[PDB]
Design a protein around this nucleic acid. Structure first.
Length: 184
RNA sequence: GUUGUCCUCCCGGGCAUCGCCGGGCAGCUACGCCGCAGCCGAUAAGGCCUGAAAGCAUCUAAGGCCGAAGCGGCCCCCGA
């Protein structure tokens, strides 16, 4: 339990990002689009003190601090989302089969995965754009949360655990999020 | 059709408690035929995102995406 009487943390907001508050509900608009969330937790008020956004509750308890810093981090993902957006780059890697990745409409379709005759599909969200260039594909969009979800829906579609996991590695995987994951 | 017998014979009948045997309509039956799904919602086990506590990491701590023949719906039966 960290103990302060304010307890108060402060979010630095650029000139590029304007934040508007209406209770516990946050909208963040910059030079490109807008994004809304509801921050829900008891007793945590978000309001704007000048150029600065403040997230506060009177009482310090351990639960609260965690939730408070997550909200700070959601703001921060909006500040670099609404400015210029988020890019995660992904690779489709195949063990045996030229594996055809195309966007047909508001779903991405992956065909010819493991010699399958059937289509695989995975959902794309209304703020996210999927571009395929060769067997690199880059998922691109206004929001990190959203971008992160779309990418992982693609991966969860190709999922394989019904055979050995060392000698079938067919699928599209996360080469990049925003750093490079990972070394074993 | 036929064995026994009674009606004198002929024909046409009775009983032998379907007389025995052969065939069979209607009906009822099978050993016969006809018909008996998919899909959506919300979840579990599980897989993940963001994402802190614990400046990182992390599928959960809050929020979010999927995901059982099971659950609800769909269907079928009854039902002022």
């Amino acid at each position: 339990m960290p103990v302060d009487a304010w307890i108060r943390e402060e979010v630095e907001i650029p000139e590029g990002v304007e934040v508007t508050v209406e209770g516990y509900k946050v909208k963040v608009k910059g030079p490109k689009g807008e994004l809304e969330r509801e921050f829900f937790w008891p007793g945590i008020q978000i309001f704007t003190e000048d150029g600065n956004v403040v997230i506060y509750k009177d009482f310090p308890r351990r639960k609260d601090v965690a939730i408070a810093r997550t909200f700070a981090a959601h703001i921060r993902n909006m500040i670099k989302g609404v400015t210029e957006g988020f890019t995660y780059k992904l690779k489709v890697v195949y063990s045996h089969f030229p594996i055809s990745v195309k966007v047909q409409g508001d779903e991405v379709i992956i065909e010819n995965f493991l010699g399958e005759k059937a289509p695989r599909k995975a959902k794309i969200l209304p703020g996210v754009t999927v571009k395929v260039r060769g067997q690199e594909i880059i998922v691109e969009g206004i929001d990190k949360e959203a971008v992160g979800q779309t990418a992982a829906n693609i991966e969860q579609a190709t999922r394989i655990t019904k055979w050995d996991r060392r000698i079938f590695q067919d699928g599209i995987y996360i080469v990049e999020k925003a750093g490079k994951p990972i070394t074993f």
